[PDB]
Short mmCIF file of C-alpha atoms and ligand atoms in Angstrom, two decimals:
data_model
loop_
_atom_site.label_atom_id
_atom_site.label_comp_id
_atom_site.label_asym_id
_atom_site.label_seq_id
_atom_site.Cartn_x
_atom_site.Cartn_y
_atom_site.Cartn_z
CA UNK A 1 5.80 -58.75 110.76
CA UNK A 2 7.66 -59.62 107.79
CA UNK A 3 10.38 -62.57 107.91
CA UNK A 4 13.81 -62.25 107.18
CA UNK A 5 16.59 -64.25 106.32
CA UNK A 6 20.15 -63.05 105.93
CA UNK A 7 22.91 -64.52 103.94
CA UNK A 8 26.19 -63.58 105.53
CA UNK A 9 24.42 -63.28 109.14
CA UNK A 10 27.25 -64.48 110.59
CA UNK A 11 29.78 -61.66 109.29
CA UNK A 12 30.47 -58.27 111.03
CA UNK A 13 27.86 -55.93 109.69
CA UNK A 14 25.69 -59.19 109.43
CA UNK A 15 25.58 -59.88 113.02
CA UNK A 16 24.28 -56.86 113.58
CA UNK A 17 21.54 -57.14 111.08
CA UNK A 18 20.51 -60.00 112.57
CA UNK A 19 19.85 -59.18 115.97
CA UNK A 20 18.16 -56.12 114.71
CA UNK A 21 16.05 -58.26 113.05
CA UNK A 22 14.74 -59.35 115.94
CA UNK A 23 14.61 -56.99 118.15
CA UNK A 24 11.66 -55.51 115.79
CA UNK A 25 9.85 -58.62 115.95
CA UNK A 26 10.67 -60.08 112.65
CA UNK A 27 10.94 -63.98 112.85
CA UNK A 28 14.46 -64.52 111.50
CA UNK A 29 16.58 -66.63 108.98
CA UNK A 30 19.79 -66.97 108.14
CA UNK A 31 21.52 -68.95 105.19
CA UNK A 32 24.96 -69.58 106.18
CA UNK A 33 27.08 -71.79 104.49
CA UNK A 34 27.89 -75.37 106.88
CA UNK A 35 31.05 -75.87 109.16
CA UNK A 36 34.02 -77.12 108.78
CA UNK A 37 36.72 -78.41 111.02
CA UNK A 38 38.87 -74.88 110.52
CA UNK A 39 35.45 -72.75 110.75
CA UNK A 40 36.60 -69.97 113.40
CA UNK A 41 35.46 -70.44 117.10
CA UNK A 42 34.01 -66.88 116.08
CA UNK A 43 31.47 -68.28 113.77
CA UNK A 44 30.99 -71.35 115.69
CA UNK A 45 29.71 -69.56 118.38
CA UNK A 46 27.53 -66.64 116.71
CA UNK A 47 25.52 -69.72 115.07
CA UNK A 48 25.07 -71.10 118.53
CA UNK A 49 24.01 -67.59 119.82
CA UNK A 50 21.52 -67.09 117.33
CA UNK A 51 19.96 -70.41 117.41
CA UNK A 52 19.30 -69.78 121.54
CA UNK A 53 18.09 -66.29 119.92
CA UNK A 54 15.56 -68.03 117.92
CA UNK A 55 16.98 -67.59 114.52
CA UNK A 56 16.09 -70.33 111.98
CA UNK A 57 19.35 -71.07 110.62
CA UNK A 58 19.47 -73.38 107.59
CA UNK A 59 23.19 -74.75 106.45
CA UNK A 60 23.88 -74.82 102.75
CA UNK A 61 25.90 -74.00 99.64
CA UNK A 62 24.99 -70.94 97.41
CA UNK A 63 24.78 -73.16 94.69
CA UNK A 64 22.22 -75.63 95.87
CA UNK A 65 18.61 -73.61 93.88
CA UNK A 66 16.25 -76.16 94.90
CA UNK A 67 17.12 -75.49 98.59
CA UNK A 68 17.25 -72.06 98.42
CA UNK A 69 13.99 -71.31 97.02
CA UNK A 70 12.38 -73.68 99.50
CA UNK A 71 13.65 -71.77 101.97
CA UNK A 72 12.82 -68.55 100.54
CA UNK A 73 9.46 -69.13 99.82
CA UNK A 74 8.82 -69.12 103.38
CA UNK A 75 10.07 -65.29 104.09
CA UNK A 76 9.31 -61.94 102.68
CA UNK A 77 12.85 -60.11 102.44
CA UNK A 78 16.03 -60.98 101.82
CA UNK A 79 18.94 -59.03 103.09
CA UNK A 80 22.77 -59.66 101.74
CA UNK A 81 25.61 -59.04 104.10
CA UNK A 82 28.55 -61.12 102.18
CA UNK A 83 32.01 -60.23 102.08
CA UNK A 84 33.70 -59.03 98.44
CA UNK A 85 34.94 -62.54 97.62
CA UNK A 86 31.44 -63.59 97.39
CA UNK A 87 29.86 -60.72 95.80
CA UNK A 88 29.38 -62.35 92.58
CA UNK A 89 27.99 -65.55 94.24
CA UNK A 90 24.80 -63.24 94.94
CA UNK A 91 23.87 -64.04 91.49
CA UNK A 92 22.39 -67.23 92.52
CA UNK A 93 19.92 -65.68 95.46
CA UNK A 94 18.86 -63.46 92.58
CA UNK A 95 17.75 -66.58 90.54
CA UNK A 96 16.30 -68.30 93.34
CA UNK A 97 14.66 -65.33 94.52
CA UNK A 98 13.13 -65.09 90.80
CA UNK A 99 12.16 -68.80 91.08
CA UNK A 100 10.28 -68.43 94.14
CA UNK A 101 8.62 -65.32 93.17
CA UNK A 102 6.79 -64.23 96.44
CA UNK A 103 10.17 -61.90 97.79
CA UNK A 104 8.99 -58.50 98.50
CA UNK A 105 12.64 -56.81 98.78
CA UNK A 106 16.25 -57.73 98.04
CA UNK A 107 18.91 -55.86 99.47
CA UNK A 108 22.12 -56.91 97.78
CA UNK A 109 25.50 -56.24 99.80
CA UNK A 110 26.50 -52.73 98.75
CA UNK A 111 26.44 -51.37 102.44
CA UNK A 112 29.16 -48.83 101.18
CA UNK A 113 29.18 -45.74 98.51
CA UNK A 114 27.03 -45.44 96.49
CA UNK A 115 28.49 -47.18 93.18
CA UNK A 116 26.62 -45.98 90.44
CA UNK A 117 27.69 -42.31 90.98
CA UNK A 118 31.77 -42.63 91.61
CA UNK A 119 34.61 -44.10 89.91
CA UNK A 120 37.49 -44.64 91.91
CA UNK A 121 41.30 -45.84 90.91
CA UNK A 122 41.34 -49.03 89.37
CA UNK A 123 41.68 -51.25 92.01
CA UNK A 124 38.61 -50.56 93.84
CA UNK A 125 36.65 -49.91 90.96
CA UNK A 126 37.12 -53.49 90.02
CA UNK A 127 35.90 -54.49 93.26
CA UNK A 128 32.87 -51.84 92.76
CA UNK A 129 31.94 -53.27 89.46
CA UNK A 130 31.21 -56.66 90.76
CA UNK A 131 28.59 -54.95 92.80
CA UNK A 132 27.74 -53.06 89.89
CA UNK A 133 26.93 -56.19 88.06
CA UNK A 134 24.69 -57.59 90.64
CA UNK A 135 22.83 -54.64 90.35
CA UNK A 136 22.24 -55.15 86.24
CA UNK A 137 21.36 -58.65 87.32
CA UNK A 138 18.60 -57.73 90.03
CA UNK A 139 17.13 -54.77 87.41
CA UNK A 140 17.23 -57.88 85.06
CA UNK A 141 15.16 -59.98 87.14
CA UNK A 142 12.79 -57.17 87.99
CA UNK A 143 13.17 -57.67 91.35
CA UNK A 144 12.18 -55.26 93.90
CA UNK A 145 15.30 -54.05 95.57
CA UNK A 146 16.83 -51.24 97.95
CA UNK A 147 20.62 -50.14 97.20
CA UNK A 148 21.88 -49.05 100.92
CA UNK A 149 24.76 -46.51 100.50
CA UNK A 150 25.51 -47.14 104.35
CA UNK A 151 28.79 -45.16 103.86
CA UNK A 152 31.41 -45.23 106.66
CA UNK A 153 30.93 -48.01 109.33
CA UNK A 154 31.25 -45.95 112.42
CA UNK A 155 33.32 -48.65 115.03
CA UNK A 156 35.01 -49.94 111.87
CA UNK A 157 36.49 -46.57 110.58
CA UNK A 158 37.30 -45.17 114.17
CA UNK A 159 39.43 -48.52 115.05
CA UNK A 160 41.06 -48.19 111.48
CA UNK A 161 41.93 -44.06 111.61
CA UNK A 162 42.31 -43.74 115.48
CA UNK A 163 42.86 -47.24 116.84
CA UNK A 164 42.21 -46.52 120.44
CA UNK A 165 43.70 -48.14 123.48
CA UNK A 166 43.68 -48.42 126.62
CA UNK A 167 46.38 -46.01 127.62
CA UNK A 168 47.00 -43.58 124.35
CA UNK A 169 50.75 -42.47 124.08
CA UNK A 170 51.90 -39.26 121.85
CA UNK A 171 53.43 -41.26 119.63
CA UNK A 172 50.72 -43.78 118.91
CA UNK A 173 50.54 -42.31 115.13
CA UNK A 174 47.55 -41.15 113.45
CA UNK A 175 48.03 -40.98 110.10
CA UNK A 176 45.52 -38.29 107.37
CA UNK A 177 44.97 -39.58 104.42
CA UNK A 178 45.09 -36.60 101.49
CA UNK A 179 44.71 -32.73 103.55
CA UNK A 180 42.18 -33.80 105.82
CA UNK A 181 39.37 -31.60 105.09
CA UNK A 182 37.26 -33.97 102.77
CA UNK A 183 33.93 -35.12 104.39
CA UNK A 184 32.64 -38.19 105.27
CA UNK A 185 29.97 -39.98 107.20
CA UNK A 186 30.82 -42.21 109.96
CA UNK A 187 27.62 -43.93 111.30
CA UNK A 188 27.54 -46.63 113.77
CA UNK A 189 26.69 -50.32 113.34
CA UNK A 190 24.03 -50.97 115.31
CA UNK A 191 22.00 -48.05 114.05
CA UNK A 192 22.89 -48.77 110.02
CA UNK A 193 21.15 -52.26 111.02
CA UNK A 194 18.36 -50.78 112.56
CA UNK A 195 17.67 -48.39 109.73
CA UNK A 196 18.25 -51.47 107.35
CA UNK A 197 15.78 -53.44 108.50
CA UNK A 198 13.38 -50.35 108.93
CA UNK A 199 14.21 -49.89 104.98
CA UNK A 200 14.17 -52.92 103.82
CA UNK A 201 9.83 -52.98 105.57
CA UNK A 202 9.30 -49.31 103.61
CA UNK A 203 7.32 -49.20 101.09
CA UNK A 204 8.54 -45.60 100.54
CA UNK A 205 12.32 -47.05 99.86
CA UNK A 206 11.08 -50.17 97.49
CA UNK A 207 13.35 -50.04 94.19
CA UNK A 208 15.09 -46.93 95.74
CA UNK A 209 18.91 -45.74 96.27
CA UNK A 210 18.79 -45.22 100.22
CA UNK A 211 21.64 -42.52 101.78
CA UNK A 212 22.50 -42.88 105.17
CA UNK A 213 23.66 -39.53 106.36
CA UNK A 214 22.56 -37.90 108.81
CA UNK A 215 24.09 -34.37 109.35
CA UNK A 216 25.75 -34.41 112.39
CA UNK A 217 27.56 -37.24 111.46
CA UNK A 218 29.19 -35.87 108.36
CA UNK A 219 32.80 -34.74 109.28
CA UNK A 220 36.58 -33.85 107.98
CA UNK A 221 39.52 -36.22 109.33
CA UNK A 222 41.10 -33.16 111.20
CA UNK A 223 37.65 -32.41 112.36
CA UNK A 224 37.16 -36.31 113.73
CA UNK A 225 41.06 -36.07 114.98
CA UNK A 226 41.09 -32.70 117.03
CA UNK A 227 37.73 -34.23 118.83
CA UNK A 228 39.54 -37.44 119.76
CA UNK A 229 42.31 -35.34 121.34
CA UNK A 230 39.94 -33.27 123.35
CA UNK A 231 38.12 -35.95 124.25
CA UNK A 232 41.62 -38.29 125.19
CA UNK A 233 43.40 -35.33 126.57
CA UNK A 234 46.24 -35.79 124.54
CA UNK A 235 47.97 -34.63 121.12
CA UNK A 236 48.69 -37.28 118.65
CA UNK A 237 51.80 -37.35 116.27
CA UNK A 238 49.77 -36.69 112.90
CA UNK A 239 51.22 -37.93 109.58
CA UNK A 240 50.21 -37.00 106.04
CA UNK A 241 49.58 -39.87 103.28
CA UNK A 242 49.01 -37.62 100.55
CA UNK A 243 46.72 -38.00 97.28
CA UNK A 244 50.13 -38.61 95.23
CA UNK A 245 51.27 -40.99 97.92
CA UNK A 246 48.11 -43.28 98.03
CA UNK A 247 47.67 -42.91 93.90
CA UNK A 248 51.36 -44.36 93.49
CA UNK A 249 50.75 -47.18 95.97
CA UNK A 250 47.70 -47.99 94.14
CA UNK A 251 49.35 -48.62 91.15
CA UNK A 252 52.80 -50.47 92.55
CA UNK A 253 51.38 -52.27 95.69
CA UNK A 254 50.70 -56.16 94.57
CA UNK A 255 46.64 -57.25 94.85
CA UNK A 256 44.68 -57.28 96.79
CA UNK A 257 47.08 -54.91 98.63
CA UNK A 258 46.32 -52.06 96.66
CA UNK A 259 42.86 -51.75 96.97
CA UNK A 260 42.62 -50.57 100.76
CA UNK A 261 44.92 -47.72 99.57
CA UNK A 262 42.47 -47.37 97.00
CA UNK A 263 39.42 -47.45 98.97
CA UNK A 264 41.08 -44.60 101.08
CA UNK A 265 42.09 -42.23 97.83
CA UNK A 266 37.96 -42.51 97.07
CA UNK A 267 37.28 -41.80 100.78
CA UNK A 268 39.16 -39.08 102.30
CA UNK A 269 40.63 -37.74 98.96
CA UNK A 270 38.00 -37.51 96.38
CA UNK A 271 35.60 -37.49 99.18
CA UNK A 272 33.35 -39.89 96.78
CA UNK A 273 30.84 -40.44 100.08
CA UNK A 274 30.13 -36.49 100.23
CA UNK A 275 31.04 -35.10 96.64
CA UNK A 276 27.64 -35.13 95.88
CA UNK A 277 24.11 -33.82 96.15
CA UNK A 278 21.00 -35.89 97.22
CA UNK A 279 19.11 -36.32 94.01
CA UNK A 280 15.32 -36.45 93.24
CA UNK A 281 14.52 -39.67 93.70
CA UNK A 282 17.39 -40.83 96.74
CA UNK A 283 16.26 -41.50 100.27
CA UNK A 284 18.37 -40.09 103.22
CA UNK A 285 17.14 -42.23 105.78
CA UNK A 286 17.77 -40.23 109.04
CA UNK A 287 14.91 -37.93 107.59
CA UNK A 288 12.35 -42.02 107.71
CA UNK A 289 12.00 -42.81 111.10
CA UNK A 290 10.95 -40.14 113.93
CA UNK A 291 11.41 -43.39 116.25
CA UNK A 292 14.83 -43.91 115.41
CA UNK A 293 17.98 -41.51 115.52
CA UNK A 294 21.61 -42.38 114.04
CA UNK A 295 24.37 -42.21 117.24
CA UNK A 296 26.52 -39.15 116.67
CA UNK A 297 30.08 -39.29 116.35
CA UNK A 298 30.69 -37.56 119.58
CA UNK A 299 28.49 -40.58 120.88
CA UNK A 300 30.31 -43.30 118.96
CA UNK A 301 33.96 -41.83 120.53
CA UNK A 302 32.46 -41.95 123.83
CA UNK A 303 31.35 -45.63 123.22
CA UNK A 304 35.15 -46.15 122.44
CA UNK A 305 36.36 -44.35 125.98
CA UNK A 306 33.03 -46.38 127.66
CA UNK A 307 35.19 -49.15 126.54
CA UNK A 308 31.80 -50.57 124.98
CA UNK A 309 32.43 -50.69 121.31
CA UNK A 310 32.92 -53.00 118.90
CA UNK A 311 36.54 -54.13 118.70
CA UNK A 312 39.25 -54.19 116.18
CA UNK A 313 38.24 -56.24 112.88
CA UNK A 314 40.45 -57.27 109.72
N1 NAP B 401 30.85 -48.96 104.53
C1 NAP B 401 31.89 -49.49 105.19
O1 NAP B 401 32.62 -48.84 105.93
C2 NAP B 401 32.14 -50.96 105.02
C3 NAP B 401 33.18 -51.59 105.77
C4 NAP B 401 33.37 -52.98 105.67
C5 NAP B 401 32.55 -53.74 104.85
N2 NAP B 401 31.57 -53.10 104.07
C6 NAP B 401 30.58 -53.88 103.26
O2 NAP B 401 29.67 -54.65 104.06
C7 NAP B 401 29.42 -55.89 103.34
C8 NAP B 401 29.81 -57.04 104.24
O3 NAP B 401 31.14 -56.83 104.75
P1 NAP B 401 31.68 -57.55 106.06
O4 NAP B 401 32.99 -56.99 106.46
O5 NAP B 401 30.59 -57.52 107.08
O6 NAP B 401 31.83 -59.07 105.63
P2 NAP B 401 32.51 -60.24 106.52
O7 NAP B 401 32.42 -59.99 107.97
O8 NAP B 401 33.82 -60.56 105.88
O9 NAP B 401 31.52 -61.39 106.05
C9 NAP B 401 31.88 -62.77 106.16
C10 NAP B 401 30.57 -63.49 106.23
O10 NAP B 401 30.09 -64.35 105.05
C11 NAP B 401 30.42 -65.72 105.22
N3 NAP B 401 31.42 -66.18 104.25
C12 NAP B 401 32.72 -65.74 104.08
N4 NAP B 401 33.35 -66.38 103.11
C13 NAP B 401 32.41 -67.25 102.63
C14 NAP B 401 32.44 -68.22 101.59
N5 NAP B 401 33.55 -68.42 100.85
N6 NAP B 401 31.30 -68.96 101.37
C15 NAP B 401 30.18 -68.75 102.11
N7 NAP B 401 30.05 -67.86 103.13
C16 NAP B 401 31.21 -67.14 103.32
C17 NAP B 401 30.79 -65.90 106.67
O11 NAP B 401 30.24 -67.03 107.28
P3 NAP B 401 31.06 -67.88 108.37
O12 NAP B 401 30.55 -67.50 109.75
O13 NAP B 401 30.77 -69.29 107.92
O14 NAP B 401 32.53 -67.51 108.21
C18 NAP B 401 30.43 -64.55 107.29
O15 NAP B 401 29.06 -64.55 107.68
C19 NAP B 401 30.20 -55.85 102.00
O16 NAP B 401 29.37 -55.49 100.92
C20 NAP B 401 31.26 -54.84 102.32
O17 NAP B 401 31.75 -54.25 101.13
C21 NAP B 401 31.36 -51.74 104.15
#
């Protein structure tokens, strides 16, 4: 199988890449950057899990070439799970990637929209355009890539719009950002690494845009709300943020502050995830694998009541 080594293995959609690296029999790498006396007990311990899971994990900075294309001569793909702040850092795996010349895909970290078909207010379009930029630089390189517009995490988005607990009170606020009626995709974790990885092996998605959204998991924030309530037996005290409401605090809110406001106009007011049509050559990956099946959102709430899913995350 082909190896794989992560950079940002160690974050929270990276931790999931990794083990789903694998659990499909890929020997696996991370690069992870080395520890310091304030590194979280978090990451302290998910470097000691994957090591007893067999992970090669080699310690460096992103700015040390020579080590980095040593290392990545020895694998086949190269995944990106970094955080925004180090975005533009990704620059350098593109130039030792180039250097050691026998990568067969890069994945940057986009893991989100899809960037080259929306514009949202200025505060996340910043943001977008560093990603944007990575992209020019990969195209540059001639490197063969995959762009994975993962959309919604699923755990992520439900803990941010519903928040669940253990004993739900009517006045435990959920708030609707714009109407309500704009559609997104919410797809679990677990299953947006498993379709990564499966991607990232495809010849069919090399140098491809790659959709993940699979139909039943495409949904309206009144839709996802009045399903929680069934499902919680319970009626929630709903408030509106509308458009005009998020647009202002985009644009008075200090930074980075007003980019999650931002991020939510694009989401659940433009509806930037769904405003658009699958074009010629884009993948929707639910449509790849007959082995594999993306959780539906009336399976991810029910991972939430199982008390099974992933908790709350900043
Ligand atoms: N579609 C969605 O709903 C959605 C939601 C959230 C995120 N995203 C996207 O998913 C991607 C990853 O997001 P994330 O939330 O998973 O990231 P995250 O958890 O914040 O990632 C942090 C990870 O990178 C490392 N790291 C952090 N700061 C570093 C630094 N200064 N130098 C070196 N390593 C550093 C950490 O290693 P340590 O263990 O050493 O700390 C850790 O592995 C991004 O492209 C993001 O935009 C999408």
């Amino acid at each position: 199988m082909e190896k794989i080594i992560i950079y940002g293995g160690t974050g929270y959609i990276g931790k999931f890449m990794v083990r789903a690296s694998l659990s499909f029999s890929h020997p696996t790498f991370i690069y992870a950057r080395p520890l310091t006396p304030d590194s979280t007990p978090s990451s302290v311990q998910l470097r000691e899990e994957f090591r007893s899971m067999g992970v090669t994990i080699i310690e460096g900075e992103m700015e040390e070439h020579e080590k980095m294309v040593s290392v990545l001569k020895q694998v086949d793909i190269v995944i990106s799970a970094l955080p925004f702040p180090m975005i533009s850092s990704q620059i350098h795996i593109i130039n030792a990637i180039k250097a050691a010349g026998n990568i067969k895909r890069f994945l940057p970290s986009d893991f989100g929209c899809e960037e080259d078909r929306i514009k949202p207010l200025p505060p996340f379009e910043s943001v977008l355009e560093k990603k944007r930029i990575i992209r020019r630089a990969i195209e540059a390189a001639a490197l063969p890539y995959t762009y994975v517009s993962a959309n919604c995490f699923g755990a992520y988005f439900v803990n941010y719009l519903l928040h669940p607990s253990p004993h739900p009170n009517r006045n435990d606020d959920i708030v609707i950002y714009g109407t309500g009626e704009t559609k997104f995709v919410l797809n679990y974790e677990e299953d947006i690494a498993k379709y990564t990885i499966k991607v990232a092996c495809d010849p069919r998605c090399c140098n491809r845009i790659v959709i993940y959204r699979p139909p039943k998991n495409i949904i309206s924030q009144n839709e996802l709300i009045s399903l929680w309530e069934a499902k919680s037996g319970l009626s929630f005290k709903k408030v509106h943020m509308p458009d005009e409401q998020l647009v202002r605090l985009s644009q008075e809110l200090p930074q980075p502050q007003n980019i999650p406001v931002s991020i939510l106009h694009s989401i659940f007011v433009k509806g930037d995830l769904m405003s658009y049509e699958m074009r010629k050559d884009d993948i929707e990956a639910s449509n790849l694998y007959p082995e594999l099946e993306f959780t539906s959102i009336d399976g991810l709430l029910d991972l939430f009541i199982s008390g099974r899913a992933p908790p709350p995350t900043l």
